[PDB]
Design a protein around this ligand. Structure first.
Ligand SMILES: [K+]
Ligand SMILES: [K+]
Ligand SMILES: [K+]
Ligand SMILES: [Mg+2]
Ligand SMILES: [Mg+2]
Length: 136
RNA sequence: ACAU
DNA sequence: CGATGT
């Protein structure tokens, strides 16, 4: 319907899928970059989108902020709601880092509480999410 | 089919 | 064109 401008927007960026994964969070109103994750050598788009939301939850909780989070990823929103990232990515030596970070994010969700609304960014109506990397 |  | 996901 209407954009909630008082919000945090998150997005993944990648080089290949699977490939090098990063993510960032921005103030929806102003575009100010609030956090950026150092690139992870091998991961998937959906793992990165999941980590971005969970990082947003942790960022907002530490700052006592009740703002919602926007994500464009139907998959990642569902994984966060379930507290379980149902990724198909093989677990091997090459993917150990991303899977460690995903496991740690699930662990955080299972030991902490939050009321943050996690909202779908409506790309078909509103254009690209404000945290997008501009690579498509 | 839809969402990345 | 290829991939990740519900
Ligand atoms: K998009
Ligand atoms: K992009
Ligand atoms: K498909
Ligand atoms: Mg996205
Ligand atoms: Mg994007």
């Amino acid at each position: 319907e209407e954009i909630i401008w008082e919000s945090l927007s998150v997005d993944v960026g990648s080089q290949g899928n699977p490939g090098i994964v990063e993510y960032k969070g921005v103030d929806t109103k102003t575009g100010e970059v609030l956090f950026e994750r150092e690139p992870i050598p091998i991961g998937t788009n959906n793992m990165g989108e999941f980590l971005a939301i969970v990082h947003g939850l942790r960022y907002l909780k530490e700052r006592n902020s009740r703002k919602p989070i926007y994500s464009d990823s139907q998959t990642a929103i569902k994984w966060v709601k379930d507290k379980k990232a149902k990724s198909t990515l093989v677990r091997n030596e090459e993917t150990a880092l991303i899977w460690k970070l995903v496991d740690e994010a699930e662990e955080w969700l299972n030991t902490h509480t939050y009321e943050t609304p996690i909202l779908k960014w409506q790309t078909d109506k509103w254009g690209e999410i404000k945290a997008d990397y501009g690579r498509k």
